Paper text:
Properdin is the only known intrinsic positive regulator of the complement system. Properdin stabilizes C3bBb, increasing the half-life of the enzyme complex 5- to 10-fold. Properdin forms seven domains, an N-terminal domain of unknown fold, followed by six thrombospondin type I repeats (TSR) domains. Oligomeric full-length properdin consists of ring-shaped vertices, formed by N- and C-terminal domains of separate protomers.
IMAC-affinity purification yielded stable protein complexes consistent with one-to-one non-covalent complexes of PN1 with P456 and PN12 with P456, denoted PN1/456 and PN12/456, respectively. Both PN1/456 and PN12/456 yielded monodisperse peaks during size-exclusion chromatography (SEC) consistent with a single monomerized species, whereas recombinant full-length properdin produced a SEC spectrum with multiple peaks consistent with a mixture of dimeric, trimeric, and tetrameric properdin. In the absence of properdin, ~75% of the C3bBbdgf‡ was dissociated into C3b and Bbdgf‡ after 1 h at 37°C, whereas in the presence of PN1/456 or PN12/456 dissociation of C3bBbdgf‡ was reduced to ~20–25%, indicating that PN1/456 and PN12/456 stabilized C3 convertase to a similar extent. However, our construct PN1 is terminated at Cys132. As a consequence, we observed a non-native disulphide bond between Cys93-Cys132 and increased disorder at the C-terminal end of TSR1 in the structure of PN1/456 and PN1/456-CTC; however, the overall fold of TSR1 was not affected. The crystal structures of PN1/456 and PN12/456, obtained by co-expression of N- and C-terminal parts, clearly revealed that the ring-shaped vertices are formed by two contact interfaces between N-terminal domains of one protomer and the C-terminal domains of another protomer. The structures of PN1/456 and PN12/456 showed that the properdin vertex consists of the STB domain, TSR1, part of TSR4, TSR5, and TSR6 domains. These domains form a ring-like structure through interfaces formed by the STB and TSR1 domains with TSR4 and TSR6, respectively. The distal part of TSR4 is held in place by interaction with the STB domain, but the proximal part, where the short Trp-ladder, comprising Trp260 and Trp263 in strand A, Arg282 in strand B and Arg302 in strand C, is located is at a different position in each of the three structures resulting in a distance of 28.3 Å between the Cα atoms of TSR4 Ser255 in PN1/456 and PN12/456. In all structures, the O-fucosylation of TSR4 is especially well-defined and is involved in properdin oligomerization. The refined model of PN1/456 taken from PN1/456-CTC was used in molecular replacement to solve the structures of PN1/456 and PN12/456.
Residue numbers in the entry:
A (entry chain A): 255 to 418, 425 to 466
B (entry chain B): 28 to 132
The structure:
Amino acid sequence: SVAGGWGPWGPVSPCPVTCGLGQTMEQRTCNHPVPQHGGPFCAGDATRTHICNTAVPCPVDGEWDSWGEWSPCIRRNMKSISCQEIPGQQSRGRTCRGRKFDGHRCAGQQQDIRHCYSIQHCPLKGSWSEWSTWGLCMPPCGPNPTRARQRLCTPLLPKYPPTVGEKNVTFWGRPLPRCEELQGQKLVVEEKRPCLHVPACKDPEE
Amino acid sequence: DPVLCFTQYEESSGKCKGLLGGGVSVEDCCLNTAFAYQKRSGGLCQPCRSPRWSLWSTWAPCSVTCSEGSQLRYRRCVGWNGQCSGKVAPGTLEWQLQACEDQQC
Ligand SMILES: *[C@@H]1O[C@@H](C)[C@@H](O)[C@@H](O[C@@H]2O[C@H](CO)[C@@H](O)[C@H](O)[C@H]2O)[C@@H]1O
Ligand SMILES: *[C@H]1O[C@H](CO)[C@@H](O)[C@H](O)[C@@H]1O
Ligand SMILES: *[C@H]1O[C@H](CO)[C@@H](O)[C@H](O)[C@@H]1O
Ligand SMILES: *[C@H]1O[C@H](CO)[C@@H](O)[C@H](O)[C@@H]1O
Ligand SMILES: *[C@H]1O[C@H](CO)[C@@H](O)[C@H](O)[C@@H]1O
Ligand SMILES: *[C@H]1O[C@H](CO)[C@@H](O)[C@H](O)[C@@H]1O
Ligand SMILES: *[C@H]1O[C@H](CO)[C@@H](O)[C@H](O)[C@@H]1O
Ligand SMILES: *[C@H]1O[C@H](CO)[C@@H](O)[C@H](O)[C@@H]1O
Ligand SMILES: *[C@H]1O[C@H](CO)[C@@H](O)[C@H](O)[C@@H]1O
Ligand SMILES: *[C@@H]1O[C@@H](C)[C@@H](O)[C@@H](O)[C@@H]1O
Ligand code: NA
């Protein structure tokens, strides 16, 4: 009897998000005229979508950076504990980065604390390590890729108690290990060799 | 330069998902740091979150079929509005080259 027809596009609905971009739309209805006694419904789209900008930035939650370096091993009210069987303490921190527009602060510990022994600048007896495994080829994209392994004068650490409220005590600091000369070196012996049949570094998106 | 804006970024794959559409700046897309964008031409999907290194790719296969060769892998500074380790810009690749031998040949 009567074929459906679309009415006019209505107004744009309010943006459904409270920050950044969203999808809004305008709608129309098959009522101009409404279908009657078996007449067809309207062909095509009842909806037409748009991107809407709120122009408002969303909150950004903070995120922990990685731990900073351990502070020096020291004991409150002792001038110097290095090269001595005297536990100290040290701490390291990390920063909540990127927190913005009322985003969440980070959850968890900001500061890390432990007992240490100081062997900072402490001369120790060393023995030579076996070869390391071959390192990476350097430079990986430059013209001369060469890989290396090394033997190191390894310090012999003092037989101090590992724990001492019974808590772990960690050696900290760069000692000065004393070795027999090996191939004219007192600390590091290095081997190099070229990497063979070197590929070219190509951005996989190019 | 207008981009394609996605509602979702997939960390594991680094894929853009849930296209909002085009005709938007990165600036507007990334008002929501949960969003991701792509150039109209295609290629690298960038998340709107702050820049951080991607995981190393698996090792690419041995430059030679049975002799000693080498093989590459990479990671990328991926994100927006900042820099990765070593004052580095989003999109920047870092490469590692490993010595390689496929079979005892
Ligand atoms: C409405 O007000 C805004 C200031 C935000 O707080 C909105 O929350 C945000 O909602 C979007 C979804 O559109 C999420 O992606 C954001 O992560 C969330 O912060 C709030 O709905
Ligand atoms: C509504 O949609 C289009 C007009 O824009 C046509 O398919 C027909 O007028 C329909 O009822
Ligand atoms: C809605 O869209 C356009 C105008 O926005 C016209 O073709 C007509 O008004 C339609 O109903
Ligand atoms: C600090 O703690 C360890 C490394 O000591 C890791 O979980 C990570 O680097 C964190 O920032
Ligand atoms: C402190 O502990 C050791 C050095 O003794 C390393 O894991 C790192 O330097 C950390 O900050
Ligand atoms: C160096 O280390 C010890 C002695 O310092 C020995 O295993 C050997 O001399 C090595 O070359
Ligand atoms: C390194 O070189 C070989 C092993 O590759 C041996 O002579 C020994 O392990 C040395 O440390
Ligand atoms: C370097 O050479 C061989 C072959 O890659 C390695 O397997 C080994 O670890 C050495 O350091
Ligand atoms: C690549 O290097 C190692 C694993 O091979 C990890 O530190 C991490 O997966 C990184 O992205
Ligand atoms: C690649 O396959 C290996 C097994 C060797 O036969 C090579 O010579 C060949 O090119
Ligand atoms: Na000490």
